[PDB]
Design an enzyme around this catalytic site. Structure first.
Site, PDB file in Angstrom:
ATOM      1  N   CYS A  11       1.529   3.892   6.898  1.00  0.00           N
ATOM      2  CA  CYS A  11       2.304   5.242   7.398  1.00  0.00           C
ATOM      3  C   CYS A  11       1.673   6.375   6.619  1.00  0.00           C
ATOM      4  CB  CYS A  11       3.699   4.989   7.202  1.00  0.00           C
ATOM      5  SG  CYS A  11       4.253   3.353   7.519  1.00  0.00           S
ATOM      6  N   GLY A  57       2.284  -0.602   5.409  1.00  0.00           N
ATOM      7  CA  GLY A  57       1.770   0.484   4.629  1.00  0.00           C
ATOM      8  C   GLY A  57       0.886   1.561   4.812  1.00  0.00           C
ATOM      9  N   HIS A  78      10.640   8.597   6.171  1.00  0.00           N
ATOM     10  CA  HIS A  78      11.279   7.336   6.154  1.00  0.00           C
ATOM     11  C   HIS A  78      10.706   6.725   4.528  1.00  0.00           C
ATOM     12  CE1 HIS A  78       7.544   5.116   6.837  1.00  0.00           C
ATOM     13  NE2 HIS A  78       7.487   5.716   8.072  1.00  0.00           N
TER      14      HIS A  78
END
Ligand SMILES: CC(C)(C)NC(=O)[C@@H](c1cccnc1)N(C(=O)c1cnc[nH]1)c1ccc(C(C)(C)C)cc1
Ligand SMILES: CC(C)(C)NC(=O)[C@@H](c1cccnc1)N(C(=O)c1cnc[nH]1)c1ccc(C(C)(C)C)cc1
EC number: 3.4.19.12
Lengths: 305, 305
Positions: free
Chosen positions: B145, B143, B41
């Site tokens: 991820c 953030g 993503h």
């Protein structure tokens, strides 16, 4: 979201851990530049543990009585000396993985990460606090001696704890990296009572703020209190007194949540007097006192190293 | 003595964390050999978050649209592909700090360490568990991820989790290193609620064994029970069923303490039916279920890496 017992990344400290053997005794050393630091009780024997004369014991030792191993490499000890309760072994090779570091003696109530090691090899890392009675509630087995506690600032490792020994109640005692024990403890096998412990009030307030940030709000009331009236209640429940410095230190969390510190004190005042009624706060059924205000800000703002 | 939430040493994983930037989106990637792994993503935009066509977004991208950064070193991208929900960026340089690794898909109930990262830099390490409903109760901010979860066997790192997104109740969802989500969650902004969770029974029993090893024995009663009579009570309190494999897995802990598993099941049965009466076990007023039997053995026997 979420709140966990979070330690510092352990990489910089792993590259400093070595194995120190003296006779039949093995424990861990810290290798920084050309010096290995370890507990001086490594030179003790079973016949000496009750009351060893460490001066006499060290005099009897030679460099070849210390076997220092860094992985597969054996480091030659070229000198040995004693600074308080820490043995300092000068070795012929400087550790090329020595990070930026400093030695720091921490205050009660402050936290640090422990890299638990056995035979010079890291086993795990966890977070713990210096209790008000200068013990630490660690997780340490036989031979864990020489494992260190540390904090990471900027890019600099602040070493604050070296583990020496377990105490009767299952808690642990150790030194700063200059070999000065935290608390009244001594490195011999003798009857050692840890002082009565208290709860770190400013850390409980910080953890309550961490709860509000994560949506756990049921304990909030509409009341406020004075610092003096709160400390009269904290006295009864064996909580450390709260100072104006503690209130100012909680400034960042108070501003982020919009809850005045004296308001949170009133909520904690009600929690101590009424209990939690079987409810939970951040997945805990007890009040947690091993997160400092800085710890909560680090985990809820996301600083990196 | 003592028992803590203990994570693996994170040094081997720290040397694999990089920063990945696509357009104005920045998250973390995992650099192993000449391939960087990161959540797909990252190629998503604000107007695409509701229902993105990832096939369309990837085919229009070029290698120069990805910024990969390992500290200060800029890694030039020479190829890109998508496997399920993970993006794989082929870089010109193999990571000289690549450890022995493998990709593993864990089962609900197993635990792992998480190295939380922001902008490719490690922030902290903690221990997590895969819940029965295939979520994890981690600590992740915006953030985070691309942060990975892992276990360490001797010198081999088993990567088992990559963080993708947060769910409404504050729990977290992610994939294995092949891009397959744990649970039925998808990487888009949509109504996806985690199912009702259950308690990992084999983990609670191991934690009870940890307590007995540390001298906490007040919950041991004179009763015993059968495996079926226990599972009838465990089903009523939303506990996972106890299998014969779970009994055999608890073999080492039962032999270390001399307490039969069915004896410990009878003690846990009484705890579920009568509560803990305000008492604590290993410093906790709730039954902990995020320690596997292997975790207890590792911490109470002291294996290193
Ligand atoms: C003092 C008691 C409670 C009997 N045992 C410990 O504290 C014990 C231990 C056990 C678990 C965790 N930490 C430490 N410990 C060691 O495991 C050890 C010493 N050297 C290598 N290992 C230890 C530490 C110090 C000593 C002295 C020589 C100073 C008396 C003896 C043993
Ligand atoms: C989906 C919601 C709950 C609104 N936000 C998150 O989960 C959020 C986040 C926040 C805290 C912890 N983990 C993740 N998250 C990010 O912070 C992020 C994405 N890229 C860089 N950062 C995120 C993850 C995925 C997406 C999409 C798949 C919808 C594109 C969007 C944002």
């Amino acid at each position: 979201s979420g709140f966990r017992k979070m330690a510092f990344p352990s990489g910089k400290v792993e590259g400093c851990m070595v194995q120190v053997t003296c006779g039949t005794t093995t424990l861990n050393g810290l290798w920084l530049d050309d010096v290995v630091y370890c507990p001086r009780h490594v030179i003790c024997t079973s016949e000496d543990m009750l009351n060893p004369n460490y001066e006499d014991l060290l005099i009897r030792k030679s460099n070849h009585n210390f076997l220092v191993q860094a992985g597969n490499v054996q480091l030659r000890v070229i000198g040995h000396s004693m600074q308080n309760c820490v043995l300092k072994l000068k070795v012929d090779t400087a550790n090329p993985k020595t990070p930026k570091y400093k030695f720091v003696r921490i205050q009660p109530g402050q936290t640090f990460s422990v890299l638990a090691c056995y035979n010079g090899s890291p086993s795990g890392v966890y977070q713990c606090a210096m209790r008000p009675n200068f013990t630490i509630k660690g997780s340490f087995l036989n031979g864990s001696c020489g494992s260190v506690g540390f904090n990471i600032d900027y890019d600099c490792v602040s070493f604050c704890y070296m583990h020496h020994m377990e105490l009767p109640t299952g808690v642990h005692a150790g030194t700063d990296l200059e070999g000065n024990f935290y608390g009244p403890f001594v490195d011999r096998q003798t009857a050692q009572a840890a002082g009565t412990d208290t709860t770190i009030t400013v850390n409980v307030l910080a953890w309550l703020y961490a709860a509000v940030i994560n949506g756990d709000r049921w304990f909030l009331n509409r009341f406020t209190t004075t610092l003096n009236d709160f400390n009269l209640v904290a006295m009864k429940y064996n909580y450390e007194p709260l100072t104006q410095d503690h209130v100012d230190i909680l400034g960042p969390l108070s501003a982020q949540t919009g809850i005045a510190v004296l308001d949170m004190c009133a909520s904690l005042k009600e929690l101590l007097q009424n209990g939690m009624n079987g409810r939970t706060i951040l997945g805990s059924a007890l009040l947690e006192d091993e997160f400092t205000p800085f710890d909560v800000v680090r985990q809820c703002s996301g600083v990196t190293f």
